[PDB]
């Protein structure tokens, strides 16, 4: 149909910016400077593998230097642009025309060619092929301004500028031994020009902030285990009100008469009252094996008017009867909490995911009638279903018993390690870390010399953080909402929250 052109040409990279780069050579080199420079744009095209085996470019929209050489807005959280996989190759054509035709025709090539339709001066030739492109499909992240934070002013002027005259003043300012880590850092700074508020604490930001038929419960939580803190001895002002009327009218306000929530509550409530008399400290995951399916939905409400739970300490995340302060007697030492975690990220093998038994249901029937199962308990075999477990359960194992039966208790309860020494407890913890790591691998043999050294000690695969199965069950317990059954204005009205809808209206 017309003249021919070869396409055996350089196969080159491209960079589809979201910016309106002009034709000037000062405008282009600035857009390369945002993306790290021409030397860092090229090594972004010369990188292979799936995502995060390759990390792309860093578009810094506000790239500019202050007079001191520091990066103005040195915390920009850039826009990341990565190579698009399986790109459809595209040719690029050099359109050539007389000087001044773009200016008189809206600076468009679509119309310029139409203006000089039969001129001999139009020359249109392919010059290369584009097989590779970086483009910025992701979106910009949350941004933080640190211009009036005086610590950033001290960093920026020392580590950013690399000026030695004020670098030296910084390093002579860091105390080799800091005497007050617990306090605000406004006392260690010598700028005193900006007057940060006293309650800001100058916490620096992280590198990536964007990472992509009801009842209100009122259970009590205890946030601090100081020697001053008070423990609840009576339930709560509102639940007793919601529950005292529930005795006379049998509806439990917030529910329909047809749900039988209250009749389910009492048949659960008399169960727990027997249990806390027998064992005053509990985990809810042990109570799931006792209360039937029909009255489990109302257990999260009966615990609130029978029990409280610490958010920290040795008795962390256990339900405790009212009036019972575990720091008052040593008999509450065998009930204190110990956590264990299996690191799948380091034990990523098929040998493990068959030996670790699968978690419990939300609710089940106990093999032990009316009590804790033998499957929560640790006895040197059969990894338990649930790895946060009290000292009262470990003692079935012989070696942990003869450690337990030789302990010396503290006279005053420590805010961590409880009534036990730090020694006699790591002596218990290190054994369990050794035994679980073995039976995950299917060993069950247990060399006695390593297992004997612990018992006579004087002083990682398994780790003592809370397992994710536990954290997922803590949130479902701290959530103040539960199910009873066994567009600026529209979005503002759709929520209808007591707080979320309040402030949302104020800001509009």
């Amino acid at each position: 149909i017309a003249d021919e052109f070869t396409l055996d040409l350089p196969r080159i990279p491209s960079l589809e910016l979201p910016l309106n780069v002009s034709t000037k050579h000062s405008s282009i080199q600035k857009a390369i400077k945002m993306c790290g420079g021409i030397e860092k744009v090229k090594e972004a095209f010369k990188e292979h593998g799936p995502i995060e085996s390759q990390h792309g470019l860093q578009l810094y929209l506000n790239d500019d230097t202050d007079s001191d050489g520091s990066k103005s807005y040195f915390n920009e959280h850039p826009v990341i642009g990565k190579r698009v996989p399986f790109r459809d190759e595209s040719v690029i054509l050099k359109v050539t025309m007389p000087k001044g035709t773009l200016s008189k025709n809206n600076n468009s090539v679509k119309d310029s060619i139409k203006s000089l339709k039969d001129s001999n001066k139009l020359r249109v030739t392919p010059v290369s092929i584009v097989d590779n492109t970086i483009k910025f499909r992701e979106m910009s992240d949350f941004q933080i301004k640190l211009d009036n934070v005086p610590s950033a002013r001290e960093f920026k002027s020392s580590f950013g500028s690399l000026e030695w005259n004020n670098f030296k003043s910084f390093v002579n300012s860091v105390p080799d031994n800091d005497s007050q880590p617990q306090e605000n850092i406004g006392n260690l700074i010598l700028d005193r020009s900006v007057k940060i508020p006293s309650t800001d604490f100058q916490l620096p930001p992280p590198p990536k902030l964007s990472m992509v038929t009801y009842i209100k419960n009122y259970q009590l939580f205890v946030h601090d285990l100081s020697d001053k803190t008070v423990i609840p001895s009576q339930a709560h002002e509102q639940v007793l009100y919601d529950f005292e009327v529930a005795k006379k009218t049998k509806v439990y306000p917030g529910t329909k008469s047809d749900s039988k929530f209250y009749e389910s509550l009492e048949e659960c409530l008399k169960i727990l009252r027997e249990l806390f008399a027998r064992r005053p400290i509990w985990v809810k995951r042990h109570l799931d094996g006792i209360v039937p399916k029909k009255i489990h939905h109302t257990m999260k409400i009966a615990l609130a008017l029978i029990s409280y739970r610490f958010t920290m300490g040795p008795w962390r995340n256990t339900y405790i009867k009212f009036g019972i302060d575990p720091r008052s007697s040593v008999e509450y030492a065998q009930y204190q909490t110990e956590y264990f975690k299996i690191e799948r990220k380091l034990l990523s093998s098929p040998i493990v995911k068959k030996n670790v038994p699968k978690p419990p249901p939300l609710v089940f029937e106990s093999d032990t009638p009316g009590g804790i199962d033998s499957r929560f308990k640790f006895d040197g075999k059969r990894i338990p279903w649930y790895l946060m477990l009290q000292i009262d359960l470990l003692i079935g194992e012989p070696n942990i018993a003869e450690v337990f039966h030789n302990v010396e208790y503290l006279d005053k309860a420590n805010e961590l390690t409880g009534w036990f020494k730090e020694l006699d407890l790591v002596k218990i913890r290190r054994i369990v870390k050794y035994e679980l790591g073995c039976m995950v691998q299917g060993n069950y043999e247990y060399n006695k010399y390593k297992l004997k050294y612990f018992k006579t000690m004087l002083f990682g695969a398994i780790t003592e953080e809370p397992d994710d199965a536990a954290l997922e069950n803590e949130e479902m317990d701290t959530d103040q909402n539960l199910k009873v059954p066994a567009x600026x204005x529209x979005x503002x009205x759709x929520x209808x929250x007591x707080x979320x809808x309040x402030x949302x209206x104020x800001x509009x």
Partner: protein, 330 residues
């Protein structure tokens, strides 16, 4: 032999404004070397060829000293042989006042170019030492192609692509004679579009779609003087009549309608355009036919030709603001 490249020598020294200070190193009249700018051209022609697929497999330079300097880095980079071919020397009219020069041989040029030149190849034909008018020039290039190729296709049956480094007057007669015109000074098709013979230009002659003798083959011109690899454009074009402009770039996308499978170009394809004036142009790319739609893009697309994939046997950015999206109509 299915493919031919032809290229001009480069930027001489006498073209400098301060004048011809260097002397012919070989001693022959008008055998002037290149300037340092002409050497930077020849390296840029090497890194361009080295970015292609059907790179040349043999180089047939003229014996003149500056055509050897042009092909020296092309030989080192691509690791190819360089043969002298006297039949592609300059066209000297019989009215040269000082002398009609005849260039040097192997023994003189091998001293300046050690190891690069290969002496297997005796010249097929020698220009008339008395000089030759224009009608004698073109028939000489009618004789050259049948005798040259047939001595390539039997001493080197495996070579399918070659490079010729020659001069302007030859480069324009080598093209027209190959394409089969009657005289060289006419235009290619009808539109006054001669062969662009700029300094260190590059042409391309592919065969037009059993093996057949040369004179029955049909060739087409597919580059016509590419100077885009040069950092300075075409400097000193020449055509037989001698005896403002702006550039903008546009992309032509070829999108697939499938999940995670990429279109490709066969590295030997051919492109023809038409209807570029109107809203719906039609492009052929190889055997397939397309129909386009103009679509400006928000933002820009910056392409880096200096970031090309060089093969290698061991400054300029293209600002794009408009695009064409092609759809299958075949």
């Amino acid at each position: 032999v299915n493919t031919i490249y032809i290229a001009r020598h480069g930027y001489r020294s006498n073209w400098l404004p301060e004048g011809p200070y260097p002397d012919p190193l070989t001693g022959i009249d008008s055998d002037v070397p290149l300037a340092e700018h002409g050497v930077q051209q020849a390296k840029e022609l090497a890194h361009y060829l080295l970015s292609l697929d059907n790179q040349p497999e043999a180089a047939f330079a003229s014996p003149f000293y500056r055509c050897l300097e042009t092909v020296q880095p092309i030989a080192k980079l691509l690791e190819i042989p360089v043969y002298l071919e006297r039949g592609i020397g300059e066209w000297y009219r019989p009215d040269r006042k000082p002398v009609i020069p005849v260039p040097a041989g192997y023994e003189i040029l091998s001293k300046f170019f050690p190891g690069v030149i290969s002496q297997e190849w005796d010249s097929t034909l020698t220009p008339n030492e008395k000089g030759e008018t224009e009608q004698e020039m073109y028939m000489r290039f009618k004789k050259f192609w049948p005798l040259f190729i047939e001595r390539v296709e039997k001493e080197y049956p495996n070579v399918e692509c070659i490079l010729l480094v020659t001069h302007a007057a030859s480069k324009i007669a080598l093209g027209m004679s190959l394409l089969g015109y009657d005289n060289p000074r006419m235009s290619l098709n009808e539109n006054g579009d001669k062969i662009r013979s700029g300094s260190c230009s590059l042409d391309k002659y592919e065969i037009l779609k059993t093996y057949i003798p040369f004179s029955d083959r049909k060739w087409v011109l597919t580059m016509n003087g590419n100077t885009e690899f040069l950092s300075s454009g075409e400097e000193m074009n020449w055509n037989f009549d001698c005896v403002e402009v702006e550039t903008v770039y546009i992309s032509v996308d070829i999108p697939s309608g499938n999940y995670k499978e990429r279109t490709e170009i066969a590295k030997s394809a051919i492109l023809q355009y038409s209807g570029l004036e109107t809203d719906a142009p039609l492009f052929r790319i190889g055997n397939r036919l397309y129909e386009g739609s103009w679509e400006r893009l928000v933002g820009t697309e910056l392409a880096f030709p200096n970031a090309a994939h060089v093969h290698k046997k061991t400054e300029k950015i293209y600002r794009i603001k408009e695009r064409i999206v092609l759809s299958n109509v075949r």
